[PDB]
Amino acid sequence: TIMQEVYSAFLPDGCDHLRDKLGDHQSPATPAFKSLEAFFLYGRLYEFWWSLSTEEGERMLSTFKELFSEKHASLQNSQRTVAEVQETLAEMIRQHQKSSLPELTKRLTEANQRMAKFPESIKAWPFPDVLECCLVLLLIRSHFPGCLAQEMQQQAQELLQKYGNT
């Protein structure tokens, strides 16, 4: 409600006004703007869920398709796995003080390689939680029987079942 307030106050309309002038392949600072717009979309998505708990249907739901960013959820997945492995090793050191490794190292060597494969644009500029957004989209779709969200629901399902499975 402060993330929402900033958008509602300093940019009441869409962010596309800031895209044509500079972000339309005019400056190398166009990726960061996307993140801002993405964050905006994220907030709007949550607002729609807050409305559910019809008028803004397929017309508005088609704007969130850019937010999924399959190439961007892998980064969050890798960071989460790396953080959980670091926590596991810290707990191992704590248990050694008070007193699975091969696959753990394979996971690390795949996650670090995947992170290195991404360019600096993805790593440097933030983004909202993609899997949480997919979960909220699925929750909203569950409240609309028979809509099926066309291929958007399929994309959300495959992104949610490919990365971050627990």
Added chain:
Amino acid sequence: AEVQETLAEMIRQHQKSSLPELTKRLTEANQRMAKFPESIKAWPFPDVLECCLVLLLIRSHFPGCLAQEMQQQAQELLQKYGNT
């Protein structure tokens, strides 16, 4: 030490009231200790497995370094002894 604690707990449970492999473990551990010279036994040393764990933790913070063969040595030492 863990086997001695296990036997002490067995005696306590007998007071208030796996052995073949335990004895095999003892007869291998005592033999391994006897095989070492007095230099290793008499003079202390920091916890090697904990040091390997800290090295792995530090390496996890550096992506792509791989520590060359040092990481491999730490991994094999950690997965060969003290596995739990």
